[PDB]
Amino acid sequence: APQATSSIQQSYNLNSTLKPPTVTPFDPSDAATYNSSSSLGIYDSQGNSHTMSQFFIKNEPDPNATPPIPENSWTMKVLIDGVNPLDPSNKTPMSFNVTFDASGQMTSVRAPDGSTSGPGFSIDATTNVIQFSPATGNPPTPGTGWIPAASDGKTPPTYAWNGATGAASGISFDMRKTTQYSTAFAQSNPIQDGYTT
């Protein structure tokens, strides 16, 4: 039998030289709206391939924001197959804030409101590991966890639940050792535990 992805380990260097994009808002099809992006392959319960994408956007510091944006703050946006992991009927990404200390070492991964939880996930405040929660319901209930999706192929295409699930535990996403140095955006070779066929 195939095996769904339940665990992903991947670290990044986020390029400390890059300014916030001037083109706004974020659009995954327009590289002028984000600074850097990466993708990796994951698998659902039936072994079908899916592509998880991360988009990284530098945040401008702002003491007046709700919550305030510090120095060395980035937004990470997550899509799977280009659509909302939690709801294939839209393209709302899962958004996280990633911060670094003055020496460019990662200090926190949080929801945009600063807390350790949001729709479809919780984060361990100590390790900064994101636990994407497993979707509930059958058919899976939008907003509860990853809903493996497939396109009909039309233009514009409509994505819908493909009949498969994720892993029973959801997805652990571990970006520890991520760094924010004056060097190119880079990603480690992803380690993930799903497989096909």
Coordinates of N, CA, C and O in Angstrom, one line a residue:
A1 N 0.8 -1.2 0.0 CA 0.0 0.0 0.0 C 0.9 1.2 0.0 O 2.0 1.2 0.5
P2 N 0.4 2.3 -0.6 CA 1.1 3.6 -0.5 C 0.9 4.2 0.9 O 0.1 3.6 1.8
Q3 N 1.5 5.3 1.2 CA 1.4 6.0 2.5 C 1.4 7.5 2.4 O 2.2 8.1 1.7
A4 N 0.4 8.1 3.0 CA 0.3 9.5 3.0 C 1.5 10.2 3.8 O 2.0 9.6 4.7
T5 N 1.8 11.4 3.3 CA 2.8 12.2 4.1 C 2.2 12.7 5.4 O 1.1 13.3 5.5
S6 N 2.9 12.3 6.5 CA 2.6 12.8 7.8 C 3.6 13.7 8.4 O 3.4 14.3 9.5
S7 N 4.8 13.9 7.7 CA 5.9 14.6 8.3 C 6.7 15.2 7.2 O 7.0 14.5 6.2
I8 N 7.1 16.4 7.4 CA 8.0 17.1 6.5 C 9.0 17.9 7.3 O 8.7 18.6 8.2
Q9 N 10.3 17.7 7.0 CA 11.4 18.5 7.5 C 12.1 19.2 6.4 O 12.5 18.6 5.4
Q10 N 12.1 20.5 6.5 CA 12.8 21.3 5.5 C 13.2 22.7 6.1 O 12.3 23.3 6.6
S11 N 14.4 23.0 6.0 CA 14.9 24.3 6.4 C 15.2 25.2 5.2 O 15.4 24.8 4.1
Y12 N 15.2 26.5 5.5 CA 15.4 27.5 4.4 C 16.4 28.5 4.9 O 16.7 28.7 6.1
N13 N 17.1 29.2 3.9 CA 17.6 30.5 4.2 C 16.7 31.5 3.5 O 16.4 31.4 2.3
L14 N 16.2 32.5 4.3 CA 15.5 33.6 3.8 C 16.4 34.7 3.6 O 17.3 35.0 4.5
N15 N 16.4 35.3 2.4 CA 17.4 36.3 2.0 C 17.3 37.6 2.7 O 16.3 38.4 2.4
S16 N 18.2 37.9 3.6 CA 18.1 39.0 4.5 C 18.2 40.4 3.7 O 17.8 41.4 4.3
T17 N 18.6 40.3 2.4 CA 18.7 41.6 1.7 C 17.3 42.0 1.1 O 17.2 43.2 0.7
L18 N 16.3 41.2 1.0 CA 15.2 41.5 0.2 C 14.2 42.4 0.9 O 13.9 42.2 2.1
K19 N 13.7 43.4 0.2 CA 12.7 44.3 0.7 C 11.3 43.7 0.5 O 11.1 42.8 -0.4
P20 N 10.3 44.1 1.2 CA 8.9 43.7 0.9 C 8.6 44.0 -0.5 O 9.0 45.0 -1.1
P21 N 7.8 43.0 -1.2 CA 7.3 43.3 -2.5 C 6.5 44.6 -2.5 O 5.8 44.9 -1.6
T22 N 6.7 45.3 -3.6 CA 5.9 46.5 -3.8 C 4.5 46.2 -4.5 O 3.6 47.0 -4.3
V23 N 4.4 45.1 -5.2 CA 3.1 44.7 -5.8 C 2.3 43.9 -4.8 O 2.9 42.9 -4.2
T24 N 1.1 44.2 -4.6 CA 0.3 43.8 -3.5 C -1.2 43.7 -4.0 O -1.6 44.5 -4.9
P25 N -2.0 42.7 -3.5 CA -1.7 41.7 -2.5 C -1.0 40.5 -3.1 O -0.7 40.4 -4.3
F26 N -0.7 39.5 -2.3 CA -0.1 38.3 -2.7 C -0.9 37.6 -3.8 O -2.1 37.5 -3.7
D27 N -0.2 37.1 -4.8 CA -0.8 36.3 -5.9 C 0.2 35.3 -6.3 O 1.3 35.6 -6.8
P28 N -0.1 34.0 -6.1 CA 0.8 32.9 -6.3 C 1.3 32.8 -7.8 O 2.3 32.2 -8.1
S29 N 0.5 33.4 -8.7 CA 0.9 33.4 -10.1 C 1.7 34.6 -10.5 O 2.1 34.7 -11.7
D30 N 2.1 35.5 -9.6 CA 2.8 36.7 -9.9 C 4.0 36.8 -9.0 O 3.8 37.3 -7.8
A31 N 5.2 36.5 -9.5 CA 6.4 36.6 -8.7 C 6.7 37.9 -8.2 O 7.6 38.1 -7.3
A32 N 6.1 39.0 -8.7 CA 6.3 40.3 -8.1 C 5.7 40.5 -6.8 O 5.9 41.5 -6.1
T33 N 4.8 39.6 -6.3 CA 4.0 39.8 -5.1 C 4.6 39.0 -3.9 O 4.0 39.1 -2.8
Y34 N 5.6 38.2 -4.2 CA 6.3 37.5 -3.1 C 7.8 37.6 -3.3 O 8.2 37.8 -4.5
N35 N 8.6 37.3 -2.3 CA 10.0 37.4 -2.5 C 10.6 36.1 -3.0 O 11.4 36.1 -3.9
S36 N 10.2 34.9 -2.4 CA 10.8 33.7 -2.7 C 9.8 32.6 -2.6 O 8.8 32.7 -1.9
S37 N 10.0 31.5 -3.3 CA 9.1 30.3 -3.2 C 9.8 29.0 -3.4 O 10.9 29.0 -4.0
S38 N 9.2 28.0 -2.9 CA 9.7 26.6 -3.0 C 8.5 25.7 -3.0 O 7.4 26.0 -2.7
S39 N 8.8 24.4 -3.5 CA 7.7 23.4 -3.5 C 8.4 22.1 -3.3 O 9.6 21.8 -3.6
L40 N 7.6 21.1 -2.7 CA 8.0 19.7 -2.6 C 6.8 18.8 -2.8 O 5.6 19.3 -2.7
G41 N 7.1 17.6 -3.2 CA 6.0 16.6 -3.4 C 5.6 15.9 -2.1 O 6.5 15.5 -1.3
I42 N 4.3 15.7 -1.9 CA 3.7 15.0 -0.8 C 2.7 14.0 -1.4 O 2.4 14.0 -2.6
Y43 N 2.2 13.1 -0.6 CA 1.3 12.0 -1.1 C 0.1 11.9 -0.2 O 0.2 12.1 1.0
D44 N -1.1 11.6 -0.8 CA -2.3 11.3 0.0 C -2.4 9.8 0.3 O -1.5 9.0 0.0
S45 N -3.5 9.4 0.9 CA -3.7 8.1 1.4 C -3.7 7.0 0.3 O -3.5 5.8 0.6
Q46 N -4.0 7.4 -0.9 CA -4.0 6.5 -2.0 C -2.7 6.6 -2.8 O -2.6 5.9 -3.8
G47 N -1.8 7.4 -2.4 CA -0.5 7.5 -3.1 C -0.5 8.5 -4.2 O 0.5 8.5 -4.9
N48 N -1.5 9.3 -4.4 CA -1.4 10.3 -5.5 C -0.5 11.4 -5.0 O -0.4 11.7 -3.9
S49 N 0.2 12.0 -6.0 CA 1.1 13.1 -5.8 C 0.4 14.4 -5.6 O -0.6 14.6 -6.4
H50 N 0.9 15.2 -4.7 CA 0.4 16.6 -4.6 C 1.7 17.5 -4.4 O 2.7 17.0 -4.0
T51 N 1.5 18.7 -4.7 CA 2.6 19.7 -4.6 C 2.3 20.7 -3.5 O 1.4 21.5 -3.6
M52 N 3.1 20.7 -2.4 CA 3.0 21.7 -1.4 C 4.0 22.9 -1.7 O 5.2 22.6 -2.0
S53 N 3.5 24.1 -1.7 CA 4.3 25.2 -2.1 C 4.4 26.2 -0.9 O 3.4 26.4 -0.2
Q54 N 5.5 26.7 -0.7 CA 5.7 27.8 0.3 C 6.1 29.1 -0.4 O 7.0 29.0 -1.3
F55 N 5.5 30.2 0.0 CA 5.8 31.5 -0.6 C 6.3 32.4 0.6 O 5.6 32.4 1.6
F56 N 7.4 33.0 0.5 CA 8.0 33.8 1.5 C 7.9 35.3 1.2 O 8.4 35.7 0.1
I57 N 7.4 36.1 2.1 CA 7.2 37.6 1.9 C 7.8 38.3 3.1 O 7.4 38.1 4.2
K58 N 8.8 39.2 2.8 CA 9.3 40.0 3.9 C 8.3 41.0 4.3 O 7.6 41.6 3.5
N59 N 8.1 41.2 5.7 CA 7.2 42.1 6.2 C 7.9 43.4 6.6 O 9.0 43.3 7.2
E60 N 7.3 44.5 6.3 CA 7.9 45.8 6.7 C 7.6 46.0 8.2 O 6.5 45.8 8.7
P61 N 8.6 46.3 9.0 CA 8.4 46.5 10.5 C 7.3 47.6 10.7 O 7.2 48.6 9.9
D62 N 6.5 47.4 11.7 CA 5.4 48.4 12.0 C 5.0 48.2 13.4 O 4.3 47.3 13.8
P63 N 5.3 49.2 14.2 CA 4.9 49.1 15.7 C 3.4 49.3 15.8 O 2.9 49.0 16.9
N64 N 2.7 49.8 14.8 CA 1.2 50.0 14.9 C 0.4 48.9 14.3 O -0.8 49.0 14.5
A65 N 1.0 47.9 13.8 CA 0.2 46.8 13.2 C -0.4 46.0 14.4 O 0.0 46.1 15.5
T66 N -1.4 45.2 14.0 CA -2.1 44.3 14.9 C -1.9 42.9 14.5 O -2.6 42.4 13.7
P67 N -0.9 42.2 15.2 CA 0.0 42.7 16.2 C 1.2 43.4 15.5 O 1.4 43.3 14.3
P68 N 2.1 44.0 16.3 CA 3.2 44.7 15.7 C 4.1 43.8 15.0 O 4.3 42.6 15.4
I69 N 4.7 44.3 13.9 CA 5.7 43.6 13.1 C 7.1 44.0 13.5 O 7.4 45.1 13.4
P70 N 7.9 43.0 14.0 CA 9.3 43.4 14.4 C 10.2 43.4 13.2 O 9.8 43.3 12.1
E71 N 11.5 43.7 13.5 CA 12.5 43.5 12.5 C 12.6 42.0 12.2 O 12.1 41.1 12.9
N72 N 13.1 41.7 11.0 CA 13.4 40.3 10.6 C 12.1 39.4 10.7 O 12.1 38.3 11.1
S73 N 11.0 40.0 10.2 CA 9.7 39.3 10.1 C 9.3 38.9 8.7 O 9.4 39.8 7.8
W74 N 8.9 37.7 8.5 CA 8.5 37.2 7.2 C 7.2 36.5 7.3 O 6.8 36.0 8.4
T75 N 6.4 36.5 6.2 CA 5.2 35.8 6.1 C 5.4 34.6 5.2 O 6.0 34.7 4.1
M76 N 5.0 33.4 5.7 CA 5.1 32.2 4.8 C 3.7 31.8 4.5 O 2.8 31.6 5.4
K77 N 3.4 31.6 3.2 CA 2.1 31.2 2.7 C 2.2 29.8 2.1 O 3.1 29.5 1.3
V78 N 1.2 29.0 2.5 CA 1.3 27.6 2.1 C 0.1 27.2 1.3 O -1.1 27.5 1.7
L79 N 0.3 26.7 0.1 CA -0.8 26.1 -0.8 C -0.4 24.7 -1.1 O 0.7 24.3 -1.0
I80 N -1.4 23.9 -1.4 CA -1.2 22.5 -2.0 C -1.9 22.4 -3.3 O -3.1 22.7 -3.4
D81 N -1.2 22.0 -4.3 CA -1.7 22.0 -5.7 C -2.3 23.4 -6.1 O -3.3 23.5 -6.8
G82 N -1.7 24.4 -5.5 CA -2.1 25.8 -5.9 C -3.4 26.2 -5.3 O -3.8 27.3 -5.6
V83 N -4.0 25.4 -4.4 CA -5.3 25.8 -3.8 C -5.2 25.7 -2.2 O -4.2 25.2 -1.7
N84 N -6.2 26.2 -1.6 CA -6.3 26.2 -0.1 C -6.2 24.8 0.4 O -7.1 23.9 0.0
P85 N -5.2 24.4 1.2 CA -5.1 23.0 1.7 C -6.4 22.6 2.4 O -6.8 21.4 2.3
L86 N -7.1 23.6 3.0 CA -8.3 23.3 3.9 C -9.6 23.3 3.1 O -10.6 23.0 3.6
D87 N -9.6 23.8 1.8 CA -10.8 24.0 1.1 C -10.5 24.1 -0.4 O -10.1 25.2 -0.9
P88 N -10.6 23.1 -1.2 CA -10.2 23.1 -2.6 C -11.0 24.1 -3.4 O -10.7 24.4 -4.6
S89 N -12.1 24.7 -2.9 CA -12.9 25.6 -3.6 C -12.4 27.1 -3.6 O -13.0 27.9 -4.3
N90 N -11.3 27.3 -2.9 CA -10.7 28.6 -3.1 C -9.1 28.5 -3.0 O -8.6 27.4 -2.9
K91 N -8.4 29.6 -3.1 CA -7.0 29.6 -3.1 C -6.4 30.4 -1.9 O -5.3 30.9 -1.9
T92 N -7.2 30.5 -0.8 CA -6.7 31.1 0.4 C -5.5 30.3 1.0 O -5.7 29.1 1.4
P93 N -4.3 30.8 1.1 CA -3.2 30.1 1.6 C -3.3 30.0 3.1 O -4.0 30.8 3.8
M94 N -2.6 29.0 3.7 CA -2.3 29.0 5.1 C -1.1 29.9 5.4 O -0.1 29.7 4.8
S95 N -1.3 30.9 6.2 CA -0.3 32.0 6.5 C 0.3 31.8 7.8 O -0.4 31.6 8.8
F96 N 1.6 32.0 7.9 CA 2.4 32.0 9.1 C 3.4 33.1 9.2 O 3.8 33.6 8.1
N97 N 3.7 33.5 10.4 CA 4.8 34.5 10.6 C 6.0 33.8 11.1 O 5.9 33.0 12.0
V98 N 7.1 34.2 10.5 CA 8.4 33.6 10.9 C 9.3 34.8 11.2 O 9.5 35.7 10.5
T99 N 9.9 34.7 12.4 CA 10.8 35.8 12.9 C 12.2 35.3 13.2 O 12.4 34.1 13.5
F100 N 13.1 36.2 13.2 CA 14.5 35.9 13.4 C 15.1 36.9 14.4 O 14.7 38.0 14.4
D101 N 16.1 36.5 15.1 CA 16.8 37.4 16.0 C 17.8 38.2 15.2 O 17.9 38.1 14.0
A102 N 18.6 39.1 15.9 CA 19.5 40.0 15.2 C 20.6 39.3 14.4 O 21.1 39.8 13.4
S103 N 20.9 38.1 14.8 CA 21.9 37.3 14.1 C 21.3 36.4 13.0 O 22.0 35.6 12.5
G104 N 20.0 36.5 12.7 CA 19.4 35.8 11.6 C 19.1 34.4 12.0 O 18.9 33.5 11.1
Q105 N 19.0 34.0 13.3 CA 18.5 32.7 13.7 C 17.0 32.7 14.0 O 16.5 33.7 14.5
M106 N 16.3 31.7 13.6 CA 14.8 31.7 13.7 C 14.4 31.7 15.2 O 15.0 30.9 16.0
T107 N 13.5 32.6 15.5 CA 13.0 32.7 16.9 C 11.6 32.2 17.1 O 11.3 31.7 18.2
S108 N 10.7 32.3 16.1 CA 9.4 31.9 16.3 C 8.7 31.6 14.9 O 9.1 32.2 13.9
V109 N 7.8 30.7 14.9 CA 6.8 30.5 13.9 C 5.4 30.6 14.6 O 5.2 29.9 15.5
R110 N 4.6 31.5 14.1 CA 3.3 31.7 14.7 C 2.2 32.0 13.7 O 2.5 32.2 12.5
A111 N 1.0 31.9 14.1 CA -0.1 32.4 13.3 C 0.1 33.9 13.1 O 0.8 34.6 13.9
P112 N -0.5 34.5 12.0 CA -0.4 35.9 11.8 C -0.9 36.8 13.0 O -0.3 37.9 13.2
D113 N -1.8 36.3 13.8 CA -2.2 37.0 15.0 C -1.2 36.9 16.2 O -1.5 37.4 17.3
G114 N -0.1 36.1 16.0 CA 0.8 35.9 17.0 C 0.6 34.7 17.9 O 1.5 34.3 18.7
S115 N -0.5 34.0 17.7 CA -0.9 32.9 18.6 C -0.3 31.6 18.0 O 0.3 31.6 16.9
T116 N -0.5 30.5 18.7 CA 0.0 29.2 18.3 C -1.0 28.3 17.6 O -0.8 27.1 17.4
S117 N -2.1 28.9 17.2 CA -3.1 28.1 16.5 C -3.9 29.0 15.5 O -4.0 30.2 15.7
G118 N -4.4 28.3 14.5 CA -5.3 28.9 13.5 C -6.0 27.8 12.8 O -5.9 26.7 13.1
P119 N -6.8 28.2 11.8 CA -7.6 27.2 11.1 C -6.6 26.1 10.5 O -5.7 26.5 9.8
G120 N -6.9 24.9 10.9 CA -6.1 23.8 10.4 C -4.8 23.5 11.0 O -4.0 22.7 10.5
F121 N -4.4 24.2 12.0 CA -3.1 24.0 12.6 C -2.9 24.4 14.0 O -3.7 25.2 14.5
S122 N -1.9 23.8 14.6 CA -1.4 24.3 15.9 C 0.1 24.2 15.8 O 0.7 23.5 15.0
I123 N 0.8 25.0 16.7 CA 2.2 25.1 16.6 C 2.7 24.9 18.1 O 2.2 25.4 19.0
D124 N 3.8 24.1 18.2 CA 4.5 23.9 19.5 C 5.3 25.2 19.8 O 6.3 25.4 19.1
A125 N 5.0 25.9 20.8 CA 5.6 27.2 21.1 C 7.1 27.0 21.4 O 7.9 28.0 21.2
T126 N 7.5 25.8 21.8 CA 9.0 25.6 22.1 C 9.7 25.3 20.8 O 10.7 26.0 20.5
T127 N 9.3 24.3 20.0 CA 10.0 23.8 18.9 C 9.7 24.6 17.6 O 10.5 24.5 16.6
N128 N 8.6 25.3 17.6 CA 8.1 26.0 16.4 C 7.7 25.1 15.3 O 7.5 25.5 14.1
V129 N 7.5 23.8 15.6 CA 7.0 22.8 14.6 C 5.5 23.1 14.4 O 4.7 23.2 15.4
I130 N 5.1 23.1 13.1 CA 3.7 23.3 12.8 C 3.0 21.9 12.7 O 3.5 21.1 11.9
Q131 N 1.9 21.7 13.4 CA 1.2 20.5 13.2 C -0.1 20.9 12.4 O -1.1 21.4 13.0
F132 N -0.1 20.7 11.1 CA -1.3 20.7 10.4 C -2.3 19.6 10.9 O -1.9 18.5 11.0
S133 N -3.5 20.0 11.2 CA -4.4 19.0 11.8 C -5.0 18.2 10.7 O -5.2 18.6 9.6
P134 N -5.3 16.9 11.0 CA -6.0 16.1 10.0 C -7.5 16.6 9.8 O -8.2 16.9 10.8
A135 N -7.9 16.7 8.6 CA -9.3 17.0 8.3 C -10.2 16.0 9.0 O -9.9 14.8 9.1
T136 N -11.4 16.5 9.4 CA -12.4 15.6 9.9 C -13.6 15.6 8.9 O -13.7 16.5 8.0
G137 N -14.5 14.6 9.1 CA -15.7 14.5 8.3 C -15.5 13.7 7.1 O -14.3 13.4 6.7
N138 N -16.6 13.2 6.5 CA -16.5 12.5 5.3 C -17.8 12.8 4.5 O -18.9 12.3 4.9
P139 N -17.7 13.5 3.4 CA -16.5 14.2 2.8 C -15.9 15.1 3.8 O -16.5 15.7 4.7
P140 N -14.6 15.3 3.7 CA -13.9 16.2 4.7 C -14.5 17.6 4.7 O -14.9 18.1 3.7
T141 N -14.6 18.1 6.0 CA -15.2 19.4 6.2 C -14.2 20.5 5.9 O -13.1 20.5 6.5
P142 N -14.5 21.4 5.1 CA -13.5 22.5 4.8 C -13.1 23.2 6.1 O -14.0 23.5 7.0
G143 N -11.9 23.6 6.2 CA -11.3 24.3 7.3 C -10.7 23.5 8.4 O -10.1 24.0 9.3
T144 N -10.9 22.2 8.4 CA -10.5 21.3 9.5 C -9.1 20.7 9.3 O -8.4 20.3 10.3
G145 N -8.6 20.6 8.0 CA -7.3 20.0 7.8 C -7.1 19.9 6.3 O -8.0 20.3 5.5
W146 N -6.0 19.3 5.9 CA -5.8 19.1 4.4 C -6.8 18.2 3.8 O -7.1 17.1 4.2
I147 N -7.4 18.7 2.7 CA -8.4 18.0 1.9 C -7.7 17.8 0.6 O -7.5 18.7 -0.3
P148 N -7.1 16.6 0.3 CA -6.5 16.3 -1.0 C -7.4 16.6 -2.1 O -8.6 16.1 -2.1
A149 N -6.9 17.3 -3.1 CA -7.8 17.9 -4.1 C -7.2 17.5 -5.5 O -6.0 17.2 -5.7
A150 N -8.1 17.5 -6.5 CA -7.7 17.3 -7.9 C -8.5 18.2 -8.7 O -9.7 18.6 -8.5
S151 N -7.9 18.7 -9.8 CA -8.5 19.6 -10.8 C -9.4 18.8 -11.8 O -9.1 17.6 -12.0
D152 N -10.4 19.4 -12.3 CA -11.2 18.8 -13.4 C -10.4 19.1 -14.7 O -10.8 18.4 -15.7
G153 N -9.5 20.0 -14.8 CA -8.8 20.3 -16.0 C -9.3 21.4 -16.8 O -8.7 21.7 -17.8
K154 N -10.5 22.0 -16.5 CA -11.1 23.0 -17.3 C -10.3 24.3 -17.2 O -9.3 24.4 -16.5
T155 N -10.8 25.4 -17.8 CA -10.1 26.7 -17.7 C -11.2 27.8 -17.7 O -11.9 28.0 -18.7
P156 N -11.4 28.4 -16.5 CA -10.6 28.1 -15.3 C -11.0 26.8 -14.6 O -12.2 26.4 -14.7
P157 N -10.0 26.2 -14.0 CA -10.3 24.8 -13.4 C -11.0 24.9 -12.1 O -11.0 25.9 -11.4
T158 N -11.8 23.8 -11.8 CA -12.4 23.6 -10.5 C -11.8 22.4 -9.8 O -11.7 21.3 -10.3
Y159 N -11.2 22.7 -8.6 CA -10.7 21.7 -7.8 C -11.7 21.1 -6.8 O -12.6 21.9 -6.4
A160 N -11.6 19.9 -6.5 CA -12.5 19.2 -5.5 C -11.8 18.1 -4.9 O -10.8 17.6 -5.4
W161 N -12.3 17.7 -3.7 CA -11.8 16.5 -3.0 C -11.7 15.3 -3.9 O -12.6 15.0 -4.6
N162 N -10.5 14.7 -4.0 CA -10.2 13.6 -4.9 C -10.6 12.3 -4.3 O -10.3 11.2 -4.9
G163 N -11.1 12.2 -3.1 CA -11.5 11.0 -2.5 C -10.5 10.4 -1.5 O -10.8 9.4 -0.8
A164 N -9.3 10.9 -1.5 CA -8.2 10.4 -0.6 C -8.1 11.3 0.7 O -8.6 12.5 0.7
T165 N -7.5 10.8 1.7 CA -7.2 11.6 2.9 C -5.7 11.8 3.0 O -4.9 11.3 2.3
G166 N -5.4 12.7 4.0 CA -4.0 12.7 4.5 C -3.7 11.6 5.4 O -4.5 10.6 5.5
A167 N -2.6 11.8 6.2 CA -2.3 10.8 7.2 C -3.2 11.1 8.4 O -3.8 12.2 8.6
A168 N -3.4 10.0 9.2 CA -4.4 10.1 10.4 C -4.0 11.3 11.3 O -4.9 11.9 11.9
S169 N -2.7 11.5 11.5 CA -2.2 12.5 12.4 C -2.1 13.9 11.8 O -1.8 14.9 12.5
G170 N -2.4 14.1 10.5 CA -2.2 15.3 9.8 C -0.8 15.4 9.3 O -0.3 14.4 8.8
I171 N -0.2 16.6 9.3 CA 1.2 16.8 8.8 C 2.0 17.6 9.8 O 1.6 18.8 10.1
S172 N 3.1 17.1 10.3 CA 4.1 17.8 11.0 C 5.0 18.5 10.0 O 5.6 17.9 9.2
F173 N 5.1 19.9 10.1 CA 6.0 20.6 9.2 C 7.0 21.3 10.1 O 6.7 22.2 10.9
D174 N 8.3 20.9 9.9 CA 9.4 21.3 10.8 C 10.4 22.1 10.0 O 11.2 21.5 9.2
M175 N 10.4 23.4 10.2 CA 11.4 24.2 9.5 C 12.4 24.8 10.4 O 13.0 25.8 10.2
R176 N 12.7 24.0 11.5 CA 13.8 24.4 12.4 C 15.1 24.4 11.6 O 15.3 23.8 10.5
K177 N 16.1 25.2 12.1 CA 17.4 25.5 11.5 C 17.2 26.5 10.3 O 18.3 26.8 9.7
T178 N 16.0 27.0 10.1 CA 15.9 28.1 9.1 C 16.6 29.3 9.5 O 16.6 29.7 10.7
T179 N 17.1 30.0 8.6 CA 18.1 31.1 8.8 C 17.8 32.3 7.9 O 17.0 32.1 6.9
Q180 N 18.2 33.5 8.3 CA 17.9 34.7 7.5 C 19.2 35.5 7.3 O 19.4 36.5 8.0
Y181 N 20.0 35.0 6.4 CA 21.4 35.5 6.2 C 21.4 36.3 4.9 O 20.5 36.2 4.0
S182 N 22.5 37.0 4.7 CA 22.7 37.8 3.5 C 23.3 36.9 2.4 O 24.4 37.0 2.0
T183 N 22.4 36.1 1.9 CA 22.7 35.1 0.9 C 21.4 34.7 0.2 O 20.3 35.0 0.7
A184 N 21.5 34.1 -1.0 CA 20.3 33.7 -1.7 C 19.4 32.9 -0.9 O 19.7 32.1 0.0
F185 N 18.1 33.0 -1.2 CA 17.1 32.1 -0.8 C 17.5 30.6 -1.1 O 18.0 30.4 -2.2
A186 N 17.4 29.7 -0.2 CA 17.8 28.3 -0.4 C 16.9 27.5 0.5 O 16.3 27.9 1.5
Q187 N 16.8 26.2 0.1 CA 16.0 25.2 0.8 C 16.8 23.9 0.9 O 17.5 23.6 0.0
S188 N 16.7 23.3 2.0 CA 17.3 22.0 2.2 C 16.6 20.9 1.3 O 15.5 21.2 0.9
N189 N 17.2 19.8 1.2 CA 16.5 18.7 0.5 C 15.4 18.2 1.4 O 15.7 17.7 2.6
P190 N 14.1 18.3 1.0 CA 13.1 17.9 2.0 C 13.1 16.5 2.3 O 13.3 15.6 1.5
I191 N 12.8 16.2 3.6 CA 12.6 14.9 4.1 C 11.1 14.7 4.5 O 10.6 15.4 5.3
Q192 N 10.5 13.8 3.8 CA 9.1 13.5 4.1 C 8.8 12.0 4.0 O 9.5 11.3 3.3
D193 N 7.8 11.6 4.7 CA 7.6 10.1 4.9 C 6.5 9.5 4.1 O 6.3 8.3 4.2
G194 N 5.9 10.2 3.2 CA 4.9 9.6 2.3 C 5.6 9.0 1.1 O 6.7 9.3 0.7
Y195 N 4.9 8.0 0.5 CA 5.4 7.5 -0.8 C 4.2 6.9 -1.6 O 3.2 6.6 -1.1
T196 N 4.5 6.8 -2.9 CA 3.5 6.2 -3.8 C 3.9 4.8 -4.2 O 5.1 4.3 -4.1
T197 N 2.9 4.0 -4.7 CA 2.9 2.7 -5.3 C 3.4 1.6 -4.4 O 3.1 1.5 -3.2

